[PDB]
Amino acid sequence: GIGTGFPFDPHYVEVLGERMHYVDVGPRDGTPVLFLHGNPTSSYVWRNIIPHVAPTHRCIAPDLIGMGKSDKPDLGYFFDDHVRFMDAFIEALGLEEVVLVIHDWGSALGFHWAKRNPERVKGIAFMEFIRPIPTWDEWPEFARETFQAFRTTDVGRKLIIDQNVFIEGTLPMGVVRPLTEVEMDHYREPFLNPVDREPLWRFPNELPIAGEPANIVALVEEYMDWLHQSPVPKLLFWGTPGVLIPPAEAARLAKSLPNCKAVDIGPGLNLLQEDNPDLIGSEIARWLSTLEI
Ligand SMILES: [Cl-]
């Protein structure tokens, strides 16, 4: 049974006038491993991966501003807002060198930070990550109509904010196995107050699809170009059929990105951590040792 509990003491740090919650376990010395979640999750999504890494490495898993147990100010929650809070979170923890383990919008944060701080990144493990989607054809057919509807103001906000469809519908449809009721309640908990669902709606409207929004496309293109030229060790997890990363794209990146190891997790959609956490956690732990310190 994939574990449903969240046995991590809460930690908080002041970041630009707000508090961010984070997991912090494992030994204090050595290179820390920074786990970055995306939409509509929290550090909860890493709960069954962290235990594989924490014996040998510090594990830091923040909740993005507006999400999880972090503070939820009255922001637009643009990607830019997440960048500012995460930059300040990393500095507030005094993090020097890090290994990144990143997913969905957390991977946009992680790659963008790595591009700007390349000397401080000792490895990146990533999965179902944000890349430019050049045409709506390159978005999975089964979720095309709904994400197109999410990317409207009136219909999209009614779906995501008023009716909480990204939590109640999109999130379970991002996992091959059924999420249990205990798991759904952990994911529901940050968003019981409808006004707090703003990040859940802004995030899909930030996705770089068919050239829009132009500012996000540009940013993502820039860090994908950095990633293609960087020698940083890379570990890419992928599933079948995937959502953001179909198997063919994973196979292409395994050869185009330098020093990149790709791992097939089996059946998977977006939240690969919920379908095969033991493989993801085991492989991260073993790969960390191959980085050799
Ligand atoms: Cl999204």
* Domains of the chain by residue range: 11-290
Q: Which tokens go with 230?
A: 């960087």
CA of 230 to the centre of ligand 1 (A): 26
CA of 199 to the centre of ligand 1 (A): 9
How many angstroms separate the CA atoms of 260 and 245, rounded? Answer: 15
CA of 120 to the centre of ligand 1 (A): 27
CA of 26 to the centre of ligand 1 (A): 30
How many angstroms separate the CA atoms of 47 and 54, rounded? Answer: 11
Reported as type and span, the H/E element at residue 268 is strand 260-268
* Residue 115: count of CB within 10 angstroms of its CB: 17
CA of 23 to the centre of ligand 1 (A): 23
Q: What is the dihedral of CA 272, 276, 277, 279, to 10 degrees?
A: -120
How many angstroms separate the CA atoms of 222 and 267, rounded? Answer: 30
| Resolution of the experimentally solved model in angstroms | 1.7
The radius of gyration of the chain from alpha carbons, rounded to an integer in Å, stands at 17
Reported as type and span, the H/E element at residue 241 is strand 234-241
CA of 73 to the centre of ligand 1 (A): 20
**125 three-class SS:** strand
Count the alpha carbons within 13 Å of 141 in the hemisphere toward its beta carbon: 0
Q: How far is CA 196 from the centre of its chain?
A: 19
CA of 164 to the centre of ligand 1 (A): 14
How many angstroms separate the CA atoms of 70 and 62, rounded? Answer: 8
CA of 38 to the centre of ligand 1 (A): 8
Tell me the backbone φ, ψ of residue 36, rounded to 5 degrees: -120, 115
Which of 151, 280, 275 has its CA nearest to residue 213? 151
Please enumerate in sequence order all residues whose Cβ is within 8 A of that of 72, keeping only pairs 6 or more positions apart, or say none.
65, 66, 190, 196
Q: What is the dihedral of CA 41, 94, 84, 163, to 10 degrees?
A: 20
- Identify the experimental approach: X-ray
CA of 103 to the centre of ligand 1 (A): 11
Which DSSP letter does residue 180 get?
A: P
CA of 55 to the centre of ligand 1 (A): 32
Q: What is the CATH number of domain 11-290?
A: 3.40.50.1820
CA of 104 to the centre of ligand 1 (A): 7
CA of 204 to the centre of ligand 1 (A): 4
CA of 39 to the centre of ligand 1 (A): 5
Q: Report strand pairing: 59-62 vs 18-25.
A: antiparallel
